[PDB]
A paper describes a structure:
In E. coli YtfE, the best studied RIC protein, the center is coordinated by H84, H129, H160, H204, and two μ-carboxylate bridges formed by E133 and E208. We show that YtfE establishes protein-protein interactions with the scaffold IscU, where the transient cluster is formed, and the cysteine desulfurase IscS.
The structure of YtfEM-E159L contains only one iron atom in the metal center that is located ca. 13 Å below the channel entrance. In this case, the channel is longer, with a length of about 16 Å, and although the channel entrance retains the circular shape, its diameter is reduced to ∼1.5 Å. The channel is also formed by hydrophilic residues, namely by the ligands H204, H129, H160, and residues E125, E162, and L166 located at the channel entrance. Additionally, the conformation of ligand H129 differs from that observed in the other two proteins. Specifically, the side chain of H129 is ∼7 Å apart from its original position and no longer pointing toward the di-iron center (the closest distance to YtfEM-E159L H129 is ca. 9 Å whereas in YtfeM it is about 2 Å). Moreover, the structure of YtfEM revealed that when E159, that establishes a hydrogen bond with the iron ligand H129 (H129Nδ1.E159Oε1-2.66 Å), is replaced by leucine, the position of the neighboring histidine H129 alters its sidechain conformation, pointing away from the center and toward the protein surface. Interestingly, in the YtfEM-E159L structure, no such hydrogen bond interactions are present, probably explaining why the B-values in this domain are higher than in the other structures. Thermodynamic and kinetic data indicate that mutation of E159 generates a protein with a more unstable center that releases iron at a higher rate. The mononuclear iron YtfE-E159L mimics an YtfE protein following iron release and its structure shows that the process implies the movement of one of the axial histidines that exposes the metal site cavity to the exterior, thus making possible the re-entry of another iron atom to rebuild the di-iron center.
Author numbering: 5 to 220
The structure:
Amino acid sequence: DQPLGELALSIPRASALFRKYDMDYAAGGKQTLARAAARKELDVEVIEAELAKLAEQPIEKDWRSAPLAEIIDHIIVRYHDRHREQLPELILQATKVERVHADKPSVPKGLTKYLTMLHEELSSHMMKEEQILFPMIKQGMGSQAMGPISVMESLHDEAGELLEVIKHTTNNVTPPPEACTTWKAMYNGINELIDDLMDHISLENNVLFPRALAGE
Ligand SMILES: [Fe+3]
C-alpha cells in the first residue's frame, strides 16, 4: 500500500505494532508495505485494517514537512542522547546476568560484548553525524551530502547487523520463565533501544537525508 517509512511517520502509534517481529521500516524505509508483506509471509494485508484502526487518531507532528534543523535537534535530544544513556547501563546489566545466571541454559552469553560493539559503533557514528553531517545540513549544503550521507547509511547497516545478533543472542529479546528482575528488565531496555533505534534510523534515512539531498 504505502511505504514503510510514511506509514510509521503518519500514524501516531503504528511504529510499535508496525515493528511487531521482523518489520524493517528504518533503513529499508522507502520499501513498500507490499514488499514487507511479500518476502515475510504476512497476511495479504489485514495490516491495513490494523493501520485503519489507529488511523483515526489526530495529527501530532508530521516531521515530513518540519524544518530539517528541528529534525536534527529532535534527534540529538530524543535519540542520540538517549542511546548514550541506555547502552552503558545495558552493558552493566548484561555482565551481571551473564555472571549471575551463567549456570542457566538460556543465558544470553556474549550479550555484553555485542552490546559493547554496538556502543562503540553508535558513539562513533553519532559523533560524525553531529560534527560532520548535521552541521553541513543546517548551513543549507544538503545537496552536496551524497558522500557523507552514503557513508552514514553504510554505518547504519553495520548497526542493524549488530541488532540482529543481539536479537538472536536473546531469543528474539524474549526472556525465559526463570528470568529474575535483572534479566527481564534488561530485555525491556533492549526492546526500548530497538524501538528508539529503529525510529531513529527511520527519521534519518527516510526524511532528513532525502529532503536534505533534495535541497529542501
Ligand atoms: Fe543518527
